[PDB]
Design a protein around this nucleic acid. Structure first.
Ligand SMILES: [Mg+2]
Ligand SMILES: [Mg+2]
Ligand SMILES: [Mg+2]
Ligand SMILES: [Mg+2]
Ligand SMILES: [Mg+2]
Ligand SMILES: [Mg+2]
Ligand SMILES: [Mg+2]
Ligand SMILES: [Mg+2]
Ligand SMILES: [Mg+2]
Ligand SMILES: [Mg+2]
Ligand SMILES: [Mg+2]
Ligand SMILES: [Mg+2]
Ligand SMILES: [Mg+2]
Ligand SMILES: [Mg+2]
Ligand SMILES: [Mg+2]
Ligand SMILES: [Mg+2]
Ligand SMILES: [Mg+2]
Ligand SMILES: [Mg+2]
Ligand SMILES: [Mg+2]
Ligand SMILES: [Mg+2]
Ligand SMILES: [Mg+2]
Ligand SMILES: [Mg+2]
Ligand SMILES: [Mg+2]
Ligand SMILES: [Mg+2]
Ligand SMILES: [Mg+2]
Ligand SMILES: [Mg+2]
Ligand SMILES: [Mg+2]
Ligand SMILES: [Mg+2]
Ligand SMILES: [Mg+2]
Ligand SMILES: [Zn+2]
Lengths: 82, 155, 129, 150, 145
RNA sequence: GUAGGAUAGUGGCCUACCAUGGUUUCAACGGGUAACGGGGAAUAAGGGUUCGAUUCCGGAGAGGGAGCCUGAGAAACGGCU
RNA sequence: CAGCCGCGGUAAUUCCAGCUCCAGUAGCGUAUAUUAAAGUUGUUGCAGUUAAAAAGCUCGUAGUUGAACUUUGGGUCUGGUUGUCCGGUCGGUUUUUCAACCGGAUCUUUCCUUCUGGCUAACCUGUACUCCUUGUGGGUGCAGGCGAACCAGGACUUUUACUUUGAAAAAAUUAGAGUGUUCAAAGCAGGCGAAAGCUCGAAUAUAUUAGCAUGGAAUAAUGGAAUAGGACGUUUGGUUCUAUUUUGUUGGUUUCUAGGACCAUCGUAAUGAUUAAUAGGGACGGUCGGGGGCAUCAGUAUUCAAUUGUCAGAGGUGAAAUUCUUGGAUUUAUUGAAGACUAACUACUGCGAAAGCAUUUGCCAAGGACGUUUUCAUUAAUCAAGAACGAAAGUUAGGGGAUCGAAGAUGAUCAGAUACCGUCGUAGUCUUAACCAUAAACUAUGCCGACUAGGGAUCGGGUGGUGUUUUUCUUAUGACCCACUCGGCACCUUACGAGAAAUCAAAGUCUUUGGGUUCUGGGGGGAGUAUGGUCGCAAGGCUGAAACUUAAAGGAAUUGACGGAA
């Protein structure tokens, strides 16, 4: 942080800390959580910040309630990452 | 603007000293004389094909293009057979070393060869004094359409 | 708004120099800016510099040598008529001997001396002394 | 730093590095387009459609997968509304504000807000005119604004 | 800070206008413009003016130094206005006399008072065609009455 | 604009008939100038600022305003009414 | 006398004379202008927290400005132009060993505008093959044909700005070369012989505004193919032509045809949208708020009144008094009416464009922050015209009026005191309908943008913690703890940055002077006046002088002195 930072390669920790914007390259930290409902055996590629009452592919199960940031995954639901 | 009626004054108007021979029997009848203005400006077909007279036309009349050749966008088309060009430019001032955006208009005669609308860029040739202010004559409407045919967006 | 990106970059560089930083991070990273940097390098006022490709606009890093003193940018890109160049130099630069007045022209973004050599001037961008 | 308020935030969507497709996230471009068209038909605005695509399905951006955006696609198909979406929304808001004012004569802040909204709309309208989407000699204001809306 | 004035490459007319506007705060400039000298200023914006000695008037000085400053009430010939001219050196006022023609000059301050003599703006120079200093010296003599 | 009239000739220069234009905050229009314009003058780092009645170039005027003769050329004033 | 500072009040170095003496010198003074000095008119190049100066606030047309992205790099020759390497030379000149520098041609996925023809200079040639050292040293030489060696006509140019050299910017002036007017200021003269005739000169440069000319293609704009009505062309049909040249020459009609133009269809190509600005708008999501409007709830608290009780005073006091009832006023207790307000909560706390906004719930819309792999693609920044609000008072017109309370009564005090203090108390204060449009509307700090040094907190969002507790068993919300994260109403040191200094992390990145804009100021007073405008019901507002006057007016601090400050 003083005099000779050597700015092309930071430690990744710093990058993680800083805003999703205020690193070297813009790169988001939202993920496509591949959710499975308790009902039907099928995987929904649910973006972690839904902004929607996320239904399944057809059945009205309700997977994720869109909280302002990351979605609360309604009830005992299971998920994969990205 | 206006146009259409052809022979519609108290007087009746022909191209002077130019003759529509009644003994002779051509298809055109009216022997349309026309001028090639030069300076690398084409005679528009509207002028050669049509009907209107105009003394003050540079292609079908006695006005001759010479001196300066200006261009400019058209502001007003409201008066009869003439246009108000608006010739935008920059004026330098050395005390500051910058520019102004300055105006000057040019009332110029338009031959019914051309269709001229508001906001059309128009090249104009100097000539005889036609009127009080009209010392200029339109030779080329550059913005023929300017997104006229391609106005609607839907596919 | 972000007006004169180049100017901003130059300011940043100056600030860095003042601080005693060995390097600078620049956001926007233009063609003009790049040219300026190149010129500086040629002269001998700047180390490496590297354009990051934010898959977007740009993002430069400049290695400062500790040699830069000021890296100025004159505001509107004034129109210079070859004789006025001298006057400009007198105004901006310390000494007849050294420094440069980076001015864009038909030939390219070059310093004042270079322009003179060419016999081709244009609009000013900045300076380095 | 915000057009009207003195609040200079950067609540903002980041966008990823790869213009190319995020490999595994599958489907088809044509399919996506079809879906978009369907959504448009139903009544969803471009942004809304995009959001929908993001949330449940494996789409990240249409720009990525198809190549084209969403609005453009709609236009191609014949499904973009006469009034662009944002503009329409603004108009609606203005109308609402006007209604509120009418209901409650004495309300100064509300009036101010309405005025601001109107100004914004005007700006937007002007921009559109400059572009060539909304035809010229056309003010989207107040009395006829309502009519335009519905 | 961009510092007030527009620094654009085409902002020249505006700048000029601003400058013009400012010019009306500068006092000398204003005077030059409006012709305050030509419309007022007893003299006609001139160096000198001949005037008739209406009477000899001793004026009491401002402060610190206290004395009577042997001035003259002069009526300017060309305009008809009435002013008060201080008369320099020892005596001098006697020499000047009464009802004489008297060529005035400004006192020094581009109008305004001259130090201690309040409400006084002019040196008497010549009295009936000579010169006051000369008279005082007695290098030149007066042309009788 | 159209046509005529006039002019050495262009031209709302003037007449007739028609159209409603034309200029304007890129200061139109009005008011002021102890303003004839320019070459130039003074000052003098660079940028400037002020002055230019006045030896050169133009333009106006011959107490004021009007009108015209002669003449290639004058609306002349060391012509006229 | 003294421009100014100032000298003069019985010791004048400043007045009035002599001598000395200074300065300038055939000149030197005075007056007014004006230029310099004045960065005290500022483009270069000023100021605006406090010295004069930021519109009270936001909106906003003109104007002024405005993120990044499209051809970069390498080779291969080839012209110069001065330093070098010797003077190869009769103090000057011609190459090489070398150089940097400025070009030119090209080749690199590359066109520099393209053709209808003139001239194809040239050999890419090879038709006879050889004047000839054993040769690819060398050219008499003409069918296919490289066209840049030039024209002379089309076709149609994206258009600017910018800059290049050029052509034009009368002489005198200015700069400036030459030259013995005796010198110079000048002037265009002169200079040399046999002194029979001959002979140098009378230059060059400036002026940049506009127009003309040409090269340049960075910078800045502009433009183009997204209903492709797009581009080309072996298209293949067509449609409208136009129309000259021969058919002997006129008037036709239709051809062959070669040039327009315009709809078809076939093909060709990588067929055609740059980013998606830690620019901006808009949707979405959970939130947040003493933000606004309308609607209700509390405390009540005061006041009058009702009923209720108790018998000398209670109010008020600034030290002290006046002042009120007793036929219980006050005090005690329950109510009622009214219109007010909305404590405690309440903080270097939150919201709002400011003015301003704190009980309840509800309704009504709006809003920032956030989060977002959502969407549009320059909509953006600031603004003279004009617009929206806008404390209090005042105003007109309505409701109320408890207290305080400009007006007014009135009781003391002092030389006096229609002043405080004191008691009372119309207008209001409060509200509702209209105005008004001003404030120490003050952060006495314009807005937008960027960057520069540490620290903790603190509000609102949002991440991670086998963290802790809740406990209904795992919990899951909630609520903290800690770290980071973005966000507004906030300390310490050095300042190298600043600043006149108080101080300032901005009031910094300014004589090392230029990120983008609006507005304001130019000694003090006269004066926010006079006047005119304009705006108002008015009061006043916005707008806004000069004459005249004056050497200080200010600011900041330092030491004092002082203060019914501690
Ligand atoms: Mg921001
Ligand atoms: Mg704004
Ligand atoms: Mg005294
Ligand atoms: Mg005529
Ligand atoms: Mg003059
Ligand atoms: Mg005059
Ligand atoms: Mg003159
Ligand atoms: Mg005169
Ligand atoms: Mg003359
Ligand atoms: Mg006379
Ligand atoms: Mg006469
Ligand atoms: Mg005479
Ligand atoms: Mg004469
Ligand atoms: Mg003495
Ligand atoms: Mg000056
Ligand atoms: Mg100043
Ligand atoms: Mg102030
Ligand atoms: Mg203020
Ligand atoms: Mg104010
Ligand atoms: Mg740019
Ligand atoms: Mg000279
Ligand atoms: Mg009462
Ligand atoms: Mg709070
Ligand atoms: Mg409360
Ligand atoms: Mg205004
Ligand atoms: Mg009030
Ligand atoms: Mg009282
Ligand atoms: Mg009393
Ligand atoms: Mg003043
Ligand atoms: Zn299902």
């Amino acid at each position: 942080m003083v005099l000779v930072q050597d700015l092309l390669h930071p430690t990744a920790a710093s990058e993680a800390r800083k805003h999703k914007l205020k690193t070297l390259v813009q790169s988001p930290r939202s993920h496509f959580l591949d959710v499975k409902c308790p009902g039907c055996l099928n995987i929904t590629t649910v973006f972690s910040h839904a902004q929607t009452a996320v239904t399944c592919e057809s059945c009205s199960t309700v997977l994720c309630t869109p909280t302002g940031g990351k979605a609360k995954l309604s009830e005992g639901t299971s998920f994969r990452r990205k | 603007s206006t146009e259409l009626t052809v022979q519609s004054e108290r007087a009746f108007q022909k191209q002077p000293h130019i003759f529509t021979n009644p003994k002779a029997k051509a298809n055109r009848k009216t022997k349309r004389w026309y001028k090639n203005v030069g300076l690398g400006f084409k005679t528009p077909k509207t002028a050669i094909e049509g009907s209107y007279i105009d003394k003050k036309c540079p292609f079908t009349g006695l006005v001759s293009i010479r001196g300066k050749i200006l261009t400019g966008t058209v502001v007003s088309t409201r008066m009869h057979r003439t246009i108000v060009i608006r010739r935008d430019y920059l004026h330098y001032v050395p005390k500051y070393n910058r520019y102004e955006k300055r105006h000057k208009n040019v009332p110029a005669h338009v031959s019914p060869a051309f269709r001229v609308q508001v906001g059309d860029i128009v090249t104009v040739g100097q000539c005889r004094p036609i009127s009080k202010t009209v010392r200029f004559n339109v030779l080329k409407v550059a913005s023929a359409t300017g997104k006229a045919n391609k106005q609607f967006a839907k596919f | 708004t972000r007006t004169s990106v180049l100017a901003d970059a130059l300011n940043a560089i100056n600030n860095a120099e003042k601080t005693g930083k060995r390097q600078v991070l620049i956001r926007p990273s233009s063609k003009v800016i790049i040219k300026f940097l190149q010129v500086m390098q040629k002269h001998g006022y700047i180390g490496e510099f590297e354009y990051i490709d934010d898959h977007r606009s740009g993002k430069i890093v400049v290695q400062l040598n500790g040699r830069l003193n000021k890296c100025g940018v004159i505001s509107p890109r004034f129109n210079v008529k070859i004789a006025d160049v001298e006057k400009w130099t007198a105004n901006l630069l310390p000494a007849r001997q050294f420094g440069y007045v980076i001015l864009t022209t038909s030939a390219g973004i070059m310093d004042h001396e270079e322009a003179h050599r060419k016999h081709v001037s244009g609009k000013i961008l900045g300076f380095v002394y | 730093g915000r057009m009207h308020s003195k609040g200079k935030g950067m609540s903002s969507s980041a966008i990823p590095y790869s213009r190319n497709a995020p490999a595994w996230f599958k489907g088809s471009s044509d399919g996506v387009v079809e879906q978009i068209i369907k959504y448009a038909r139903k009544g969803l605005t471009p942004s809304q459609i995009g959001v929908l695509l993001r949330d449940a399905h494996g789409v990240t951006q249409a720009k990525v997968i198809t190549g084209n955006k969403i609005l453009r696609i709609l236009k191609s198909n014949g499904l973009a509304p006469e009034i662009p979406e944002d503009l329409y929304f603004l108009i609606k808001k203005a109308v609402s504000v006007r209604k509120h004012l009418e209901r409650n004569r004495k309300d100064k802040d509300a009036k101010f807000r309405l005025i601001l909204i109107e100004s914004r709309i005007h700006r937007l309208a002007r921009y559109y005119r400059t572009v060539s989407v909304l035809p010229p000699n056309w003010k989207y204001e107040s009395a006829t604004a309502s009519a335009l809306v519905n | 800070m961009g510092k007030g004035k527009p620094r654009g490459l085409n902002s020249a007319r505006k700048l000029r206008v601003h400058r013009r506007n400012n010019r009306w705060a500068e006092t000398t400039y204003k005077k030059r413009l409006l012709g305050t000298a030509f419309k007022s200023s007893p003299f006609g914006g001139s160096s000198h003016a001949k005037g008739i000695v209406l009477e000899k008037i001793g004026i009491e000085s401002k402060q610190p130094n206290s004395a009577i400053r042997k001035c003259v009430r002069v009526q300017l010939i060309k305009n008809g206005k009435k002013v008060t001219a201080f008369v320099p050196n020892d005596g001098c006022l006697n020499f000047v006399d009464e009802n004489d023609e008297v060529l005035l000059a400004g006192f020094g301050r581009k109008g305004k008072a001259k130090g201690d003599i309040p409400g006084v703006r002019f040196k008497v120079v010549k009295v009936s065609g000579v010169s006051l200093l000369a008279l005082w010296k007695e290098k030149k003599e007066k042309p009788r009455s």
